[PDB]
């Protein structure tokens, strides 16, 4: 017997496919613990979840628990170095994050499997004694202000708080969880608050052992993992805190039957219908909300969305239960809106109740429950193995809701059929219980009210009683039907015998004029799934802006046509993803192999014989137009990235020219485009999974045959296969492109140091440098210097060429950011010299681990092979190669590189910069070097015209 453990749970129910081993237990202090042993793991991981979050913010200091969450990283009593934690992770091939929901704070990391203890030790200290250093507090507060700034002009966040701000303002639901500089510093200062005290108070109050869950995954035995957790965690003090409850719904009497008219940032049209419901969490075994979600949100024949779409009122629908906190939930039905749809909100909603009526009239259907239960049992049996960081985080959250034994299964398995609950919930989905929100730009000027935090323009209104009544007397509508049996549900799960001449990597098993088939039968995972991947090539998909718009619209109309038929495939774990590229088209079909050929064939067949609906075309096109415009609202750092993409690629049509060319797109014009595009193609494919060589060849041949027979498709010349090149910046040059972001009041910057095209050695020079400076950049540019919340560095790789890049979104002007990266860059060379050849081998070791990290799921392996294929590099063995070569490097090699390619006065320094200025802008602290006279990019195609272009990498 052991005093530190309260108990060990019985066998934790796992999938029979899951080779990992699990143990559940409760510590004497009350912490619930899942331990995961996985002797194969390359990265170990752990997470902690506290059942406290921003719903428990002091009302006088909004965002304290989010802030507390940021502060825990910045040093503890026993590892006081501000970034000891993030550096230890960085040097041992790990990484970390955290988040704060209304009732949770969740902290997780991974590390190289061999440094679990080290990582874990430093990590426990967050919950034992965090310094909340007084000057760390001052600095890190800006990070939060930026976190928020980002969100201010963001349509989803505004809506998210706007909901909170129109229920009982007495309710903790109505709190602002993020916080900013104002609520965490400027206001607490005015009100004489010692924040470091409040951070100590709140931590000591709530970070209590009984409100805590831990998951630990590593190669260690279950006994080792046990002793280990006992060791680092027995010592967290139990303050016995009562777990917050919220029996009162934030939406009370007066908050029902309300209409809100809301002005968005982007030009989007949306209708949010919401009903309050009580907390369904405890019904999880039988789950009535999912049942109604499945049905109301259904998209097949008969479905609510079908009629709404056919009347050309909505395009998409989400519906179902949506979490609140302990005590209250919501049930929602949300759709977007065509221009017509906007003028028929009253009608749309009526149909909604009409459909709800049909449900009441039919009553609970057990076979529908059966279907849900079986799909979930299949989902569970053959669930892909999760990346450990995500897994631990996820389970730590659910340890607060399910018996130990159930944690794994709890969010999957269904057990009890409950017509009473289905009925009981259904009863709440009534007009007298409804809230309605319309988000449109048509409400510009028309609003009389403003949200405190985001500044959202809205009007409120009681919904007229005659209207409610029209909705209450909603009849049966003969357009609405329950779904029928899902024929796509799989039933064949046999894992075909592993073929006699299978190989570690995909073999090129076909190389004809029309197609190039890559194939590997799965030798790792043995689930009954497959990925089927196809690059279709056409000169016509991108030949000009107009053709781009058509390649898009075409494909959107295809998806839209197929949607009803394909929904069923998707509930059944068969899904497809089809879009236009700058080379033509991409098609990926993923999921259980069993009915896979069916979907594929229906897709190809539809493409090749496609019949456009006039009304659909007009609607999709209107949306695409708004969509191009809505780019204007994107975050500064993405404008930055977008412009850089445009500047450095041989051919790239701007959103502006796409928008411009889009009126010229007529129904006649598109009918003609489709066959044009479809008549000359080359297909390169990856087929990877539970399938045989022959099965694969058939599938490939079937695609081709379907095209030939229906579109008369013929090959493409080898020489037509035109890959685009990257621009070649001149030795010692420096260009700057600059633009205003007319929406966000932050600025964005991307700085690109182009090195030399990809190749084993030039790759590892860049990667190792990036590894070395990865966490110093973050810690310098963010933690210390607080330039912004978004601070990123790392490699850039496009069109076979590469370089180092920095990405920052910040309140300071881009020119200023320039010099601080430049400063930082000296600081780097200055410390690559100071660093021990040990410190240096540590960093080699980290990259090594990162690079050699084995895929845990088919998709992840597929993806790697795809990367090789679409980049025409075909270096399937690249990792062992590039790592082998890596170990070879030294302090000299890298210092040489820095001075050659990167340093301010490098012989071959090649620098480009995109400045995206804030809504309104113009024209202790280390040394920034004096920088050259920047050659300001005037015009994008002039710039491209006056420079060489790099080669394309030769295929391995």
């Amino acid at each position: 017997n052991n005093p530190a453990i309260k108990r060990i749970g019985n066998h934790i129910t796992k999938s029979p496919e899951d080779k990992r081993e699990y143990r559940g237990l409760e510590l004497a202090n009350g912490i619930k613990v899942l331990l995961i042993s996985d002797p194969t793991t390359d990265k170990s991981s752990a997470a902690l979840d506290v059942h406290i979050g921003s719903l428990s913010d002091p009302p006088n200091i909004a965002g304290l628990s989010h802030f507390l969450q940021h502060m825990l990283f910045l040093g503890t009593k026993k590892y006081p170095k501000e970034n000891e934690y993030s550096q230890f992770l960085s040097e041992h091939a790990g990484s970390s994050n955290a988040f704060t929901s209304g009732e949770h704070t969740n902290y997780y990391f991974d590390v190289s499997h061999e440094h679990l203890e080290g990582a874990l030790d430093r990590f426990a200290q967050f919950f034992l004694s965090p310094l909340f250093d007084e000057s760390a507090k001052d600095r890190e507060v800006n990070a939060v202000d930026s976190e928020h700034e980002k969100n201010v002009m963001n349509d989803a966040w505004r809506l998210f708080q706007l909901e909170k701000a129109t229920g009982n303002p007495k309710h903790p639901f109505s709190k602002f969880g993020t916080g900013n500089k104002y609520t965490l510093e400027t206001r607490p200062n005015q009100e004489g608050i010692d924040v470091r005290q409040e951070l100590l108070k709140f931590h000591s109050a709530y970070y209590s052992s009984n409100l805590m869950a831990v998951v630990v995954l590593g190669r260690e035995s279950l006994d080792d993992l046990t002793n280990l957790v006992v060791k680092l965690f027995s010592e967290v003090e139990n303050k016995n805190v009562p777990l917050p409850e919220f029996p009162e719904h934030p939406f009370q009497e007066e908050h029902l039957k309300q209409l809100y008219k809301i002005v968005p940032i982007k030009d989007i049209r949306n209708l949010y219908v919401t009903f309050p419901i009580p907390d369904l969490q405890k019904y999880y075994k039988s789950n009535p909300g999912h049942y109604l979600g499945h049905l109301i949100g259904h998209e097949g024949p008969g479905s609510l969305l079908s009629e709404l779409k056919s009347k050309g009122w909505v395009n998409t629908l989400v519906g179902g239960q949506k979490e609140g906190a302990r005590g209250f939930m919501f049930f929602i039905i949300n759709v977007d809106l065509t221009e017509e749809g906007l003028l028929h909100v009253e009608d749309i909603i009526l149909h909604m109740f009409q459909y709800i009526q049909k449900l009441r009239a039919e009553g609970p259907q057990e076979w529908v429950f059966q279907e849900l239960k079986d799909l979930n049992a299949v989902a569970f049996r053959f669930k892909d193995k999760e990346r450990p960081r995500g897994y631990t985080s996820k389970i730590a959250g659910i340890l607060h809701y399910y018996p130990l034994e159930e944690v794994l299964t709890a969010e999957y398995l269904l057990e009890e059929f409950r017509p009473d609950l289905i009925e009981m919930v259904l009863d709440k989905l009534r007009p007298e219980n409804v809230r309605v929100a319309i988000v449109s730009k048509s409400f510009e000027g028309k609003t009389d009210r403003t949200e405190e935090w985001y500044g959202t323009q809205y009007k409120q209104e009681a919904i007229p009683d005659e209207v409610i009544k029209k909705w209450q007397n909603a009849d049966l509508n003969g357009k609405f039907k329950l779904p029928t049996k899902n024929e796509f549900i799989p039933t064949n799960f046999e894992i075909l015998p592993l073929e006699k001449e299978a190989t570690p990597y995909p073999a090129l098993i076909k190389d004809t004029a029309m197609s190039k088939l890559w194939f590997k039968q799965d030798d790792k995972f043995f689930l009954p799934k497959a990925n089927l991947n196809f690059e279709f090539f056409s000169p016509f998909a991108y030949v000009d802006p107009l053709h781009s718009n058509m390649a898009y619209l075409y494909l959107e109309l295809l998806k839209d046509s197929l949607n009803e038929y394909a929904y069923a495939a998707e509930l059944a774990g068969l899904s497809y993803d089809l879009q236009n590229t700058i080379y033509g088209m991409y098609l990926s079909v993923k999921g259980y192999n069993d009915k896979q050929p069916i979907l594929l064939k229906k897709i190809i067949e539809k493409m090749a014989t496609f019949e456009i609906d006039e009304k659909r075309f007009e609607i999709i096109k209107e949306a695409y137009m708004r969509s191009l415009n809505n780019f204007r609202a994107e975050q500064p750092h993405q404008h930055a990235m977008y412009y850089l993409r445009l500047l450095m690629t041989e051919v790239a049509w701007t959103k502006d020219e796409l928008k411009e060319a889009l009126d010229d797109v007529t129904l006649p014009r598109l009918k003609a485009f489709i066959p044009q595009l479809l008549s000359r193609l080359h297909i390169e494919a990856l087929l990877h999974g539970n399938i045989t060589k022959q099965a694969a060849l058939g599938i490939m041949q079937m695609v081709e045959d379907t095209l030939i027979e229906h579109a008369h498709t013929k090959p493409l010349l080898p020489s037509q296969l035109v890959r685009y090149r990257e621009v070649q910046l001149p030795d010692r040059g420096w260009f700057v492109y600059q633009q205003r972001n007319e929406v966000h009041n932050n600025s964005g910057i991307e700085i690109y140091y182009q090195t030399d095209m990809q190749s084993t050695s030039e790759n590892m020079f860049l990667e190792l440098f990036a590894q070395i400076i990865s966490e110093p950049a973050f810690n310098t540019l963010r933690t210390k210097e607080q330039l912004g919340y978004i601070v990123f560095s790392g490699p850039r790789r496009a069109n076979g060429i590469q370089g180092l890049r920095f990405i920052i979104q910040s309140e300071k002007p881009p020119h200023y950011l320039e010099s601080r990266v430049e400063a930082f860059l000296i600081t780097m060379e200055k410390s690559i010299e100071d660093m021990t050849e040990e410190a240096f081998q540590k960093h080699i070791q980290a990259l090594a681990i990162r690079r050699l990290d084995k895929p845990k799921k088919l998709s992840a392996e597929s993806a790697k092979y795809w990367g090789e294929i679409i980049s025409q590099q075909y270096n399937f063995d690249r990792d062992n190669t590039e790592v082998a070569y890596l170990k070879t490097l030294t302090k000299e090699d890298i210092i040489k590189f820095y001075k050659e390619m990167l340093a301010v006065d490098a012989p071959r320094r090649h620098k480009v910069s995109v400045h995206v200025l804030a809504r309104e802008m113009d024209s202790n602290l280390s040394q920034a070097p004096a920088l050259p006279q920047p050659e300001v990019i005037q015009n994008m195609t002039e710039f491209k015209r006056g420079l060489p272009l790099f080669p394309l990498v030769k295929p391995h």
Binding site: S54, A98, F99, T100, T178, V318, G319
Partner: peptide
Amino acid sequence: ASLAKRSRQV
């Protein structure tokens, strides 16, 4: 679709 927010870092 059946329905399937959260302040962060990195």
